[PDB]
Amino acid sequence: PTRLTKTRKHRGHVSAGKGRVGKHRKHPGGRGMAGGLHHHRTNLDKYHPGYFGKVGMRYFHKQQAHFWKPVLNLDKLWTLVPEEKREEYLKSASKSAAPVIDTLAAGYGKVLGKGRIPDVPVIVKARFVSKLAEEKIKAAGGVVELI
Amino acid sequence: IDHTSKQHKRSSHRTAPKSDNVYLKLLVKLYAFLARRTDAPFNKVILKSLFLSKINRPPVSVSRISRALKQEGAAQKTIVVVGTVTDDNRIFEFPKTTVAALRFTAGAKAKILKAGGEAITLDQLAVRAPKGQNTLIVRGPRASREAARHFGFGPHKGKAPRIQSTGRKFERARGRRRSRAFKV
Amino acid sequence: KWYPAEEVPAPKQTRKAARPQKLRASLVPGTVLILLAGRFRGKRVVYLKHLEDNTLLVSGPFKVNGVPLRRVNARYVIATSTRVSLEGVNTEKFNVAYFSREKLSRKQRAEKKEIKAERIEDQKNIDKALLAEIKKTPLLKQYLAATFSLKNGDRPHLLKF
Amino acid sequence: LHPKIVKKHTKKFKRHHSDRYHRVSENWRKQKGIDSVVRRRFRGNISEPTIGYGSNKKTKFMGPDGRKVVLVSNVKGLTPLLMHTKTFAAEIAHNVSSKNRIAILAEAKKNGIKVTNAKARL
Amino acid sequence: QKTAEQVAAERVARKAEKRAAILERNAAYQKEYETAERAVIDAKREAKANSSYYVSAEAKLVFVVRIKGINKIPPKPRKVLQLLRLNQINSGTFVKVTKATSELLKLIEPYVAYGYPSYSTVRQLVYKRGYGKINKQRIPLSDNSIVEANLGNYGILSVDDLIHEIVTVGPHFKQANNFLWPFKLSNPSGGWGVPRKFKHFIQGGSFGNREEFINKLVKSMN
């Protein structure tokens, strides 16, 4: 909408809302990140830090797949169990009949223990686990199978 | 004439909803009617909390609601939310309760109704509770928004700089460690 | 979208009573009055009665100065100090009705009307009595005939009338 | 018992230097000028229009009669103003055939609606 | 809806009771003023007989009229002219004199007139240009049942009963005078009785303290 934009509303007023001393010249501070170390350091020492120099080692040809491992919290965990078939399990698995949760197939790597599951046993299947995540599953009743 | 203060200073308060939303302007009208004529504190609150913008009415999780019930001497109170009530699967045993909200999600409407509870809307809340008899107003957490982390940035405020991406090679060197000049 | 309401206006119960005109102390019945304004401006006259429409019923005898039995507004008059005693004058039947009036038709143009017999007779019955009182004190009849006018070397703010 | 329709500032707000240069129109414009004597309100210059000048809300949009002026075009456009004869005053629009005017005016005089023009070409 | 015309016979009876109670105060206050006036006269006289000079008590109550208009005042006595609430020109107060408030008067001494008014003056102000500060808002004192509603907590159940609290400087002066909205006196009908308003009372000009020549003035500015 051009009607609604503020430049319509400026029409008549000399300076288009850019002032008269300061003119609205073209690139009066340089371009696009310039004088970062010079005359913008002020702004680059607030509002950014870290913004110069090279911390840390390199990785040539870092494929973004060896760095996959998307987490899954133990709170969430049960959501990977089907919606209809949940009502039933969460109120009575009673060992040796536990709803297997394949986190991998559900698109997760590490099961990683934030929240607090119920006392119902699970049998999780996962590529990784937090020390605690296991501890929380074992103490609940289930186990972590690795894959 | 010497003015102490700034003259014609506006409210600084949504007196009306900048929302266009027909129905919500019914739901104001009714609560405005009440606020005035009841002289119940509670109605003046609801009326204000209708006008809040979306940012300021953040979603109350049916988990949170549960906590606000587990409070002492409040397990039977009618939880008035003014905002969305969102489903939360981190909790399990969500108790049997009435809840007025502006909008529920089909997760949370079902998760309440499964318990034996009652998903109400703010008009139905008005019928049952004009003055706000046994209500218990819940608000979502306003300070935990993805913007508000960036708000008030600087040395050494302990806050989030605005960056698209990501981790290292992105505001982790000069001015983020003694080893590259200084630590902010 | 609106279109205003066509119900009229009822006026508020206004709090104004109709108390009577209190005149200035100079205007005592019998007083000679100079009409400042009107058909007979200048003409000294006599103030016979304060009528109910806040108008001084006046004559100045028509037989003396050609100023008839006539209403005159208090404010267009100067009360002189001089009076003629009005003990032998009727003035009872004179009132606002006496000067009933009709804005007849509303004709204009193309080309001394009359005067009712009762109007002329009541001129006489008042005048005839007045002339007897006026003839007592000297040159008063002569005074009433002549018309008032400010001369040069007059200063109305100092004329005591 | 209606308020007298006073207009505050009847004189037209002609633009500064409307007379001076022909290129400038008599239609109002705020002098934005930095110098400007109109802008600065120097005694002896034109009155710039201001909300102060506005007319009383009772008497606003009301003409000489005390009647708002609705633009009528056909008879069906006149039918909203039927009971409201004292507060409205049809103006049969410019762009209407003489033979249509004749029909509207009849159905305005039937319903007692004061028509502002008409007059009626002749 | 029904029995509403009986409530007129109810409430007007309670008001016929109040107007008596308001009368019997105002009769007493009149006795209080005339005796307190006399008792200073008598005290002056009795003492004069005995060789001794009786000194009058310092003026409890002071009335600050702003003189100078807003717009070239320094910051400090602008702040103080904001604390007395003399934000216009030609505006008034009643400031209960102390040391504290003497020294506020010493800051603004060339932008104000002031002095020690009288019942008469305080009376003439309050009936004419007396307004309340009623939910912020400049509501006038019109009818003494309004003052009653506002200040009824601190006593003060008529406009005259407020005047009392001003004139005498009662213990509820602070609420009476904050309820009384600042006076907006006109310009003095006589004139300032000078040529140059901004000078002080020894130098002709209308500013500063002028003990009792405030009464003469304000009665005109009213």
Q: Rounded CA gap, E177 and E183, in Å?
A: 11
Give the span between the Cα atoms of D17 and D46, in whole angstroms.
10
Residue A24 tokens, joined: 């609205």
3-state secondary structure of E106: coil
Which residue among B92, B168, B173 places its CB closest to the CB of A52? Answer: B173
Asked if the bond preceding E93 is cis, omega within 30° of 0, the reply is no
Going from the C-alpha of B102 to that of each of A68, B22, B58, B131, E71, the distances in angstroms are 40, 14, 12, 18, 53
- Cβ atoms of residues D54 and D8 within 8 Å: yes
Chains B and D physically touch (3 or more Cβ atom pairs below 8 Å): no
Count CA atoms closer than 13 A to D76's CA, side-chain side. Answer: 0
Compute the distance between CA of residue B18 and CA of residue B32 in angstroms, rounded to an integer.
16
Which token pair is E125?
């102000």
How far apart (Å, rounded) are the C-alpha atoms in residues E153 and D84?
A: 54
The first and second tokens of residue E1, run together, are: 């809806």
Local structure of C115: helix, strand or coil: coil
* Residue B117, both tokens: 């509870």
Residue D11 C-alpha, separation from nearest chain A C-alpha, in angstroms: 24
Between CA C63 and CA C69 the distance in angstroms is: 11
Phi-psi region of D77 (alpha: psi -120 to 50; beta: other; left: phi over 0): alpha
- What count of other Cβ atoms lies within 10 Å of the Cβ of residue E167? 24
d(CA E73, CA E79): 10
For residue B182, the cross-strand partners are B177
The three-state secondary structure class of E95 is: strand
**Residue B116: left if φ>0, alpha if ψ -120 to 50, beta else—which one?**
left
Residue E122 and residue E94 in contact, taking contact as beta carbons nearer than 8 Å = yes
DSSP H or E run through B66: helix B62-70
- For chain B, breaks with the C atom over 2.5 A from the next N come after none
Residue of D nearest to C10 (CA): D1
Separation between Cα atoms, residue A119 and residue E48, nearest integer Å: 103
CA C146 to chain centroid, in Å, comes to: 18
Q: How far apart are CA C119 and CA E39, in angstroms?
A: 76
Chain A residues in contact with D32 (beta carbon < 8 A)? 12-14
Specify which residues D91 forms β-bridges with: D71
- Residues B92, A55: C-beta atoms closer than 8 Å: no
Of A94, A96, A101, A95, nearest in space to A80 by CA: A101
Which stretches does DSSP call E strand in chain E?
61-66, 91-92, 95-96, 112-115, 131-133, 138-140, 183-184, 208-209
Q: What is the DSSP annotation of chain A?
A: --TTSHHHHHTTSTTTTS-SSSTT-S-BTBSSS-STTTTSHHHHHSS--B-SS--S---TT--SSTT----EEHHHHGGGS-STTTTTTSS---SSS---EETTTTT--EEE--S---SS---EEESEE-HHHHHHHHHHT--EEE-
CA distances from B5 to B103, D88, E30, E85, E88 (A): 41, 46, 42, 13, 14
Asked if chain A contacts chain C via 3 or more Cβ pairs within 8 Å, the reply is no
Experimental method: cryo-EM
Which residue type occupies B169? K
CA–CA gap between residue A38 and residue A54 (Å, rounded): 19
Task: Find where tokens 């460690």 sit.
Answer: B177
Judged by DSSP in three states, E177 sits in: helix
Type of residue found at B55 = I
Give the pair of three-digit tokens for residue B5: 């203060």
Nearest-CA neighbor of C59 among C129, C113, C114?
A: C129
Contacts of B3 in chain E (CB under 8 A): 87
- Is D32 near chain A, with CB under 8 Å? yes
User: Residues D84, C6: contact at Cβ < 8 Å?
Assistant: yes
Interatomic CA distance for residues A9 and A16, integer angstroms:
9
- Report the distance separating Cα E156 and Cα D67, nearest Å: 53
Least Cα distance to C94 among C63, C134, C52 occurs for C52
Q: What is the DSSP string of B146-176?
A: TTTTTTT--TTT--PPP-SS-BTBSS-SBTS
Task: Work out whether strand C56-58 and strand C44-50 pair parallel, antiparallel, or are unpaired.
Answer: antiparallel
Can you give chain D as a three-state secondary structure string?
CCCCCCCCCCCCCCCCCCCCCCCCCCCCCCCCCCCCCCCCCCCCCCCCCCHHHCCCCCCCCCCCCCCECCEECCHHHHHHHCCCCCCECCEECCCCCHHHHHHHHHHHHCCCCCCCCCCCCC
Q: Are C74 and C27 in contact (CB under 8 A)?
A: yes
How far from E194 is each of E57, E90, E199, E201, CA to CA, in Å? 30, 16, 10, 11
Contact present, A81 and A99 (Cβ < 8 Å): yes
Write the CA distances from E84 to B95, E63, E88, E182, integer angstroms. 61, 10, 11, 9
The CA distance from E22 to E16, in Å, is 10
Residues 6+ apart with CB under 8 A from D7: D55
Rg (CA), chain E: 20
- Angle between helical axes of B62-70 and B106-114 (0-180°, round to 10): 40
- Say which of C6, C9, C11 has its CB closest to residue D83: C6
A14–D29 C-beta distance less than 8 A:
no
Cis check: omega of the bond before B156, within 30 degrees of 0: yes
Instruction: Please provide the size of chain A in residues.
Output: 147
CA–CA dist A111, A128 (Å, integer): 6
Could you tell me which residues are beta bridge partners of residue E139? E132
Task: Output the six-digit token pair for C73.
Answer: 């507004």
A 92-131 residues inside an 8 A Cβ radius of B: 115, 118
- Cβ pair C137, C57 in contact under 8 A: no
Distance (Å, whole) CA A34 – CA A27 = 11
Q: CA-CA distance, E182 to A113, in Å (whole number)? A: 69
Interchain contact, D87 vs C11, CB within 8 Å: no
At least 3 CB pairs under 8 A between chains A and E: no
Q: What is the CA radius of gyration of chain C?
A: 21
Q: After which residues is chain A broken (C to N over 2.5 A)?
A: none
Q: Are C83 and C19 in contact (CB under 8 A)?
A: no
E184 touches B: beta carbon within 8 Å: no
Task: List CB contacts (< 8 A) between E82 and chain B.
Answer: 2, 4
CB atoms within 10 A of CB E193: 14
| Pairwise CA distance, residues C71 & C58, whole Å | 6
Question: Which residues does chain D have within 8 Å of residue C11's beta carbon, measured at their own beta carbons?
Answer: 1
Residue A5: C-alpha distances to residues A9, A12, A18, A19, E147 (Å): 7, 15, 15, 18, 53
**In this complex, do B176 and A50 lie within 8 Å of one another by their Cβ atoms?**
yes
Q: Which residue of E has its CA nearest to B5?
A: E82
Phi-psi region of B179 (alpha: psi -120 to 50; beta: other; left: phi over 0): alpha
Tell me which of E87, E91, E136 to substitute to probe the interface with B (most B C-beta atoms closer than 10 Å).
E87
Number of neighbours of residue D18 by Cβ within 10 angstroms: 16
DSSP E183: E
Q: Resolution of this PDB entry, in A?
A: 3.6
C-beta neighbour count of A27 within 10 angstroms: 8
Cα(B166)–Cα(B123) distance, rounded to whole angstroms? Answer: 46
Which residues are B78's β-sheet partners? Answer: B135
Identify which of C6, C9, C11 has the shortest CB distance to residue D87: C6
Contact (CB<8Å) C9/D84: no
Contacts with D97 (C-beta within 8 Å, 6 or more apart), sequence order:
none
Give yes or no for D121 touching A (CB within 8 A): no
The residue of chain D with its CA nearest to that of A15 is D32
- Could you tell me how far CA B10 lies from the centroid of its own chain? 24
Question: D30 at the A interface (CB within 8 A)?
Answer: yes
Whether residue E60 has a cis bond before it, omega within 30° of 0: no
Measured CA to CA, the distance from residue E52 to residue B168 in angstroms comes to: 95
Mutate to test the interface with C, among D84, D85, D111 (most CBs of C within 10 A): D84
C70's enclosing H/E stretch is: strand C70-72
Segment 80-119 of chain E within 8 Å of chain B by CB: 81-82, 87-89
CA–CA separation, E173 and E145 (whole Å): 19
Question: CA B30, B36, B42, B47: dihedral to nearest 10 degrees?
Answer: 50
Residue entry with tokens 């200040």: E151
Structure tokens of A36? 């970062």
A12 CB neighbours in chain D (<8 A) are: 29-30, 32
